[PDB]
Design a protein around this motif. Structure first.
Motif, mmCIF file in Angstrom:
data_model
loop_
_atom_site.group_PDB
_atom_site.id
_atom_site.type_symbol
_atom_site.label_atom_id
_atom_site.label_comp_id
_atom_site.label_asym_id
_atom_site.label_seq_id
_atom_site.Cartn_x
_atom_site.Cartn_y
_atom_site.Cartn_z
ATOM 1 N N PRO A 179 -9.734 23.227 14.326
ATOM 2 C CA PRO A 179 -8.585 22.974 15.183
ATOM 3 C C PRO A 179 -8.464 21.520 15.583
ATOM 4 O O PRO A 179 -9.466 20.865 16.001
ATOM 5 N N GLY A 180 -7.270 20.992 15.345
ATOM 6 C CA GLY A 180 -6.909 19.616 15.686
ATOM 7 C C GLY A 180 -7.085 18.655 14.540
ATOM 8 O O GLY A 180 -6.368 17.663 14.444
ATOM 9 N N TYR A 181 -8.007 18.995 13.651
ATOM 10 C CA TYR A 181 -8.427 18.124 12.552
ATOM 11 C C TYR A 181 -8.435 18.831 11.154
ATOM 12 O O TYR A 181 -9.443 18.931 10.443
ATOM 13 N N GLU A 182 -7.282 19.340 10.785
ATOM 14 C CA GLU A 182 -7.154 20.154 9.592
ATOM 15 C C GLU A 182 -6.988 19.279 8.333
ATOM 16 O O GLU A 182 -6.128 19.488 7.487
ATOM 17 N N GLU A 183 -7.873 18.313 8.193
ATOM 18 C CA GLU A 183 -7.809 17.368 7.098
ATOM 19 C C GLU A 183 -8.018 17.945 5.685
ATOM 20 O O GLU A 183 -7.427 17.462 4.684
ATOM 21 N N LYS A 184 -8.811 19.006 5.596
ATOM 22 C CA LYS A 184 -9.083 19.602 4.314
ATOM 23 C C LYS A 184 -7.840 20.200 3.676
ATOM 24 O O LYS A 184 -7.799 20.434 2.473
ATOM 25 N N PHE A 185 -6.818 20.484 4.482
ATOM 26 C CA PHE A 185 -5.624 21.066 3.948
ATOM 27 C C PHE A 185 -4.839 20.033 3.152
ATOM 28 O O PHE A 185 -4.091 20.389 2.221
ATOM 29 N N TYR A 186 -5.012 18.774 3.538
ATOM 30 C CA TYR A 186 -4.220 17.663 3.060
ATOM 31 C C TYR A 186 -4.907 16.863 1.946
ATOM 32 O O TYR A 186 -4.225 16.384 1.065
ATOM 33 N N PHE A 187 -6.221 16.646 2.021
ATOM 34 C CA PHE A 187 -6.883 15.642 1.148
ATOM 35 C C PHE A 187 -7.926 16.224 0.208
ATOM 36 O O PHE A 187 -8.873 16.890 0.665
ATOM 37 N N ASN A 188 -7.762 15.986 -1.098
ATOM 38 C CA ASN A 188 -8.883 16.116 -2.041
ATOM 39 C C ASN A 188 -10.059 15.265 -1.484
ATOM 40 O O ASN A 188 -9.849 14.190 -1.025
ATOM 41 N N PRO A 189 -11.277 15.793 -1.511
ATOM 42 C CA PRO A 189 -12.442 14.977 -1.253
ATOM 43 C C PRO A 189 -12.429 13.768 -2.171
ATOM 44 O O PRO A 189 -12.169 13.899 -3.383
ATOM 45 N N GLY A 190 -12.737 12.609 -1.605
ATOM 46 C CA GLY A 190 -12.742 11.380 -2.331
ATOM 47 C C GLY A 190 -13.543 11.348 -3.604
ATOM 48 O O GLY A 190 -14.632 11.912 -3.695
ATOM 49 N N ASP A 191 -13.004 10.654 -4.598
ATOM 50 C CA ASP A 191 -13.670 10.520 -5.871
ATOM 51 C C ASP A 191 -13.966 9.056 -6.264
ATOM 52 O O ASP A 191 -14.293 8.800 -7.401
ATOM 53 N N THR A 192 -13.899 8.115 -5.326
ATOM 54 C CA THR A 192 -14.289 6.748 -5.653
ATOM 55 C C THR A 192 -15.797 6.549 -5.543
ATOM 56 O O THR A 192 -16.383 5.676 -6.198
ATOM 57 N N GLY A 193 -16.411 7.338 -4.673
ATOM 58 C CA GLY A 193 -17.779 7.128 -4.275
ATOM 59 C C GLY A 193 -17.692 6.076 -3.214
ATOM 60 O O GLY A 193 -16.601 5.473 -3.003
ATOM 61 N N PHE A 194 -18.836 5.794 -2.598
ATOM 62 C CA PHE A 194 -18.957 4.689 -1.610
ATOM 63 C C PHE A 194 -18.957 3.333 -2.260
ATOM 64 O O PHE A 194 -19.535 3.104 -3.332
ATOM 65 N N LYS A 195 -18.228 2.445 -1.628
ATOM 66 C CA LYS A 195 -18.014 1.131 -2.239
ATOM 67 C C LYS A 195 -18.279 -0.005 -1.331
ATOM 68 O O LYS A 195 -18.266 0.153 -0.135
ATOM 69 N N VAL A 196 -18.535 -1.152 -1.927
ATOM 70 C CA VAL A 196 -18.567 -2.417 -1.194
ATOM 71 C C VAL A 196 -17.613 -3.403 -1.844
ATOM 72 O O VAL A 196 -17.334 -3.310 -2.999
ATOM 73 N N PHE A 197 -17.133 -4.358 -1.078
ATOM 74 C CA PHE A 197 -16.061 -5.227 -1.488
ATOM 75 C C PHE A 197 -16.494 -6.628 -1.192
ATOM 76 O O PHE A 197 -16.818 -6.929 -0.061
ATOM 77 N N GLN A 198 -16.506 -7.477 -2.210
ATOM 78 C CA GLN A 198 -16.689 -8.904 -2.024
ATOM 79 C C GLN A 198 -15.425 -9.617 -1.547
ATOM 80 O O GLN A 198 -14.513 -9.876 -2.343
ATOM 81 N N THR A 199 -15.400 -9.968 -0.259
ATOM 82 C CA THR A 199 -14.271 -10.688 0.377
ATOM 83 C C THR A 199 -14.602 -12.167 0.494
ATOM 84 O O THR A 199 -15.712 -12.536 0.212
ATOM 85 N N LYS A 200 -13.688 -13.019 0.948
ATOM 86 C CA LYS A 200 -14.016 -14.467 1.064
ATOM 87 C C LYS A 200 -15.100 -14.754 2.057
ATOM 88 O O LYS A 200 -15.630 -15.819 2.046
ATOM 89 N N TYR A 201 -15.403 -13.809 2.938
ATOM 90 C CA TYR A 201 -16.304 -14.096 4.057
ATOM 91 C C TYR A 201 -17.608 -13.354 3.943
ATOM 92 O O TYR A 201 -18.630 -13.792 4.456
ATOM 93 N N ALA A 202 -17.561 -12.214 3.266
ATOM 94 C CA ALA A 202 -18.688 -11.290 3.299
ATOM 95 C C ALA A 202 -18.515 -10.165 2.308
ATOM 96 O O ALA A 202 -17.367 -9.787 1.988
ATOM 97 N N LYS A 203 -19.651 -9.659 1.815
ATOM 98 C CA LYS A 203 -19.690 -8.371 1.141
ATOM 99 C C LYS A 203 -19.540 -7.277 2.248
ATOM 100 O O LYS A 203 -20.370 -7.214 3.151
ATOM 101 N N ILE A 204 -18.489 -6.451 2.211
ATOM 102 C CA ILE A 204 -18.305 -5.504 3.281
ATOM 103 C C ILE A 204 -18.283 -4.054 2.751
ATOM 104 O O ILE A 204 -17.896 -3.796 1.599
ATOM 105 N N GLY A 205 -18.714 -3.104 3.586
ATOM 106 C CA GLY A 205 -18.626 -1.700 3.233
ATOM 107 C C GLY A 205 -17.659 -1.031 4.175
ATOM 108 O O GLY A 205 -17.805 -1.129 5.395
#
Lengths: 301, 298, 297, 297, 294, 295
Positions: free
Chosen positions: C124-150
């Motif tokens: 109740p209140g958070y019915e997210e499973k109805f809307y979203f396929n579980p993610g398929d990117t896996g966990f990621k990190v991103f090299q930005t101009k300032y930092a590697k961020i997660g």
């Protein structure tokens, strides 16, 4: 009071008999396409290998040389003209020559006349009356979808229609409607085989599992081919039909008449329905690797 | 008519919310099926109680029980062994902090051949299963019984061609789907029964194997976290043959025992000669390992 | 001395009009940049109401392709004009799949990619499973101009596995855009303290700072069973690499939070402390099960 | 001086009784062993008539699983007794797939595994595509007590790509059990010279010896459209590493062919010749097309 | 009924004087034409002695560019005069790189392009890399007025892949200008022919090979080397059958007519190209049978 | 196939660029003495820092990727046509390793091995710095030969040499830095060290190469000055274990032994000991305590 909003598309399945003369059969096709457009059709589907008899009852050297390149194909170029004139989408089924490879293929012509590319039949049947494996390399394009002026559509060919994997592959890539030109009838080695109901049920099943409408065009008439071992006859059983996205038949032909089937679909309502039913949200591709086997154990390379 | 023959049954009954009543009801209909000659009898989904997934409640989760020494499974093993029938037993599985919508396959000698855990989990008003069940991690299975190699999945799995093909590729000779589906409490105009049959009939015709579906009947009112919610379960339990034909079917309110004999040697020969398994193209199926049509899942 | 980076969490209220809300985001991003921020975090699904109180067919169609998204494109210009990094939360349509996603915009306006939310909540209140396929990117990190961020999303923040995954791949800061408040079915559930502790654990355990941006305000949504209401409880915070809170907002104020980290000195603190030296992946196979016994396929 | 290996090609006529035909195989294998053979090759599908003239439902159910195959198991007993390597052609059922397969038995009886026929011929008399899935093992080499060998099946022998694939993976000798003869729709086809030349070509291109064992006899099959007849033309041969034929049988008698090869001398003559060090795989991409432009998926 | 094409293999001994050899080539092309030839093959590097035999810095001079090549230009005039297709083997200079090359001239004299020898032996008994870089053209087919043809060169002859590559791309006839003989032990003449009959057979395309004859002595790093080139130029049909062949010691002009339409139909009905399995051919893009190359 | 091998034995400052100048100039002399494969001692980029457990020293580590030193020893490998293993302190995200990269004779970087066995105790506090390596034991096929490269403390373990020789190793290589202990000047480890390694050579019938540091080294630790005297004895042993070239404990040395390797594969294959092995009886080698297999 306003009409219900959303993109509407009218589709058509055509059903007719062929001679083994190409000009006659293309003229037959223009005539039915024209009649279809007159009934408001936007995309029109002509049956498999309509340029001639279904020659695959025989395994003959000279029949391999009925293939022609995709490039500068006279039948395709002619139907491109028709497509631009009427403003309709027209898939054109043909026997392709590609250097030393040959394929049962289909070029998708858009409503401005533009050739959007080809699909090469992936699943090739075999056995008495339907000796396709002798003629055609198994297709190498993979399952494709095409962006037309009116819709993203999925087109595959005949025997492809028995394979759930093909419908799903097209649907996962965004196909909003499936199209299967077909040539199927009796079987010359066993007159007790009547596949027509089995044939419909499997495709209705693709329509319902993917929540997309589905169009099948199949041949009518009796055709006799000279084979290596004498004459062989098939009676093509028509039963062209259009099914909605629960697999309901919305329009159907019988086993003998020439026919022009017509139906309208709201593609936006169906999109909305397809997503709320949820099957695409709940699929489990992590559990589907076994589908990449033939034998249930060993992944193909 | 020569060859190995097997008789299958779909049962169809109404449930209370008391486990003892429901198991007595199941015992009664399994015996009636055996009386009429059945070798493999299919009891419907979550038959131990009301279909409690209309609500999303903390206390309902604790209805789950371990696979090990499960009393309902243990009692039907006794029945399976007495009559020499195969009986798949649907139950709500607790496995440490995981939970599953599961099914245990009892062989005709009473032996527990193992479990299958429901893979595809539905969601939405009336059918809030994603709240209770971890998506299944057994994969699609087949089980070698006294009478046949069978493939058993559960309910919503039945909408997925991928699941039927996976069982057939692994040698399943008959498919079984215990179910619970009816009306939907947020929209009285939704009537899924024809759509539901058609998709299953498509699996049977595309794999050329017979298919058995047992579904619940009766009205059930659950107290949810937001008030009363009601489903009318629509029955239509059926048995389909290897071309998708319905050979036997029940209506939307009668208790039923449905019975069909199938010749598995003939059906095997037919499935093979039709040729679809000879003609598949796994080299072109990689896109099925995507959700979005582009990106294969990890 | 060493590479320094100023991070910011934003906390604000949403209407259900995209243009209003993006205007709000833009205003707060600018305010953080004026205070020195290099990387600025906007809360989950900020384009409109947290619609997931309902399970409605029509709400599924709020999704939009990642490609040529009008909100991501708008915020790319802002990134560029400002020289800041802006993770952009959106509801993604990808053919028939749908994801709760986030696009990471670099300080030069470059779209560096996406992460699709992995852990999808329910109830109740958070019915997210109805809307979203579980993610398929896996966990990621991103090299930005300032930092590697997660960067992960909301409910992902309750899972140590997600944080660890990001840190093992070089994340130097973790970011969690969030939507979380009371629960419409039980007025006595107050999750704010629990929520913070778990995130502080991730920060202390991987020795990386952590930023969490959460929504404020009451939202009333019409569902299949009538009205449903969440009060979002704010408490957006920045934690340092031992998990101490350096900056925190209350449960109703609109806020812009700022904190500076010396990434070279934190790296050296993280290595010295030893944990990544002493991890035993040979003994962790059980984490690839749900049930503590069976490895998943 | 160096590793010598005596290989044999066998040639015989088949009856309709399985167990008769396996006894025929046993008798000729014993006769090859007596004349010193270490590896003995039995013709394709030797358990029975070449049934592929017909396209029949009931003929498909002649397939049997690889596991506990009674012809494989019987031949294991013999390989162990005589200390000879015996590849065993058989019609494989594998759940709903069916293949034209071969199991390689080692000189101690150990079943080393199987190859499934990759290229499946078609047309009157040779309707194989109605019966067999195209093989999914890929080309293989097996390490036997005497030699690393490359075994493929029948129609595979027309494809330079298969013979090269095997030599690249270390095959020291190629084997091709075969069933080939006249064709029922055209009595003017006599393919025996063509068939030899193509294989002699592989031997010479790879600098490896090659063994082919072909059936003899007239076989009449009841098709779906009447009697169809093939006259099998024998011409089993063994070729040396430049493609010279060292031994050859006629078109109607039973034969046992024997040839000795010095494998270390040939290996050295292959390294010297240098073709493998001189190949251009950077220029061979077009081999992954069917049509000379589009690479397959 | 069908497109009939007459092809020719020439065989002669070379002197080490360029004008003499080109005059010899012309005499024999004219003789082929007189016998009806439409496409005529001259042996590899015919403008002189086979020098890849020496590792001499001076012979590098002999290379000339593809552009405005005096021998190519002269042979262009003769192609146009007689209406015959002539592939012209030559030692190409191109910009600090060098290649063993061939340029295809059509029956109207048009220069249709160039192929560069792909396989270059780093053998223990040749330092051919001394002269030639490995070809970067890849395997080509050229559309002529008479046929689609594939042409490759010398050592290329040994490689089933090169013949298959040309055939997949529509080559209807394969051509292999070569030069091969040995010192005055074994002789490779049978091994050579068998491999080549192999390609014709596997692809169901006719195949023309032209090889030189004669002894040749070059002075070198060690001193004298001598080769007796063994001739045996031949034309093979689409089942690998030899239809014309030369001996090891005389000039020859070999002639054979092929019906390219009947052969096309035969090639397709045999079925090898319908039946190929590129999905299982990846290992061919490795050298060591395991690792893909770049 | 007549492969020539070398061990080097030199002094280090704490200065990257000068130490790389010494390896450069002893590799050059190796190659002028006929060397095909030239070995360089452990962590030769600076002093053996592992006498201290300091935070700032962990940050001496560098990614494998585009490593200043690797790249310079590659130009030189290429030019001379010599194979050169390269010790370095590896950074990999938050992990850290004592690692080696094998450079072939065309400059080609063929892959890394990561120190598996990590010493500990006064003077050698390596368990503070290095994750235990996760590569496994490795054999790199080079132009000259199949070679077995492990690092330092690895030389003490029969399992490591045996593993390398099951995988085709024709030669074993061990870059090393060992010497006095700072806690106990009674402990002399040079004879014991030489002997354990000689016992592997003998057991596997493969030649062996151990390169080692000389020179004195004071490190400022967390607790005061700390001094090791590194004792060299860089040595080449043959396939029976006999030492054929051995350096002293004090001076800079360039060692050389030619080996006929096709002849040594015959001595080995013919001696029978690999086929004589009994892996059905060696399960106990997968435990630590003598009865519980590790997970």
């Amino acid at each position: 009071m306003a009409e219900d909003k959303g993109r509407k598309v009218v589709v058509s399945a055509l059903q007719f008999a062929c001679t083994d003369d190409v000009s006659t059969n293309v003229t037959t096709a223009e005539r039915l396409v024209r009649a279809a457009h007159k009934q408001g059709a936007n995309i029109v589907l002509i049956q498999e290998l309509f340029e001639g008899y279904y020659f695959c009852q025989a395994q003959r050297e000279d029949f391999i040389q009925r293939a022609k390149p995709y490039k500068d194909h006279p039948t395709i170029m002619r139907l491109q003209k028709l497509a631009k004139e009427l403003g309709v989408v027209i898939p054109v089924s043909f026997f392709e020559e590609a250097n030393n490879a040959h394929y049962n293929s289909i070029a998708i012509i858009d409503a401005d006349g533009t050739d959007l590319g080809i699909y090469r039949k992936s699943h090739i049947p075999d056995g008495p009356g339907y000796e396709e494996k002798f003629y055609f390399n198994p297709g190498d394009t993979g399952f494709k979808v095409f962006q037309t002026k009116y819709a993203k559509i999925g087109v595959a060919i005949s025997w492809d229609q028995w394979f759930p994997e093909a419908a799903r592959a097209m649907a996962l890539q965004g196909a909003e409607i499936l199209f299967y030109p077909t040539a199927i009838g009796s079987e010359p080695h066993d007159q007790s085989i009547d596949s027509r109901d089995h044939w419909k049920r499997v495709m209705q099943g693709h329509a319902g599992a993917n929540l997309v409408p589905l169009v099948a065009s199949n041949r009518i008439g009796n055709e006799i081919i000279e084979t290596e071992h004498g004459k062989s006859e098939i009676k093509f059983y028509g039963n062209s039909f259009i099914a909605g996205p629960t697999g309901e038949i919305v329009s159907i032909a019988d086993d003998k008449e020439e026919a022009v089937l017509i139906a309208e679909f709201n593609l936006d309502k169906i999109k909305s329905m397809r997503h709320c039913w949820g099957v695409f949200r709940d699929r489990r591709p992590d559990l589907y690797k076994v589908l990449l086997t033939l034998d249930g154990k060993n992944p193909v390379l």
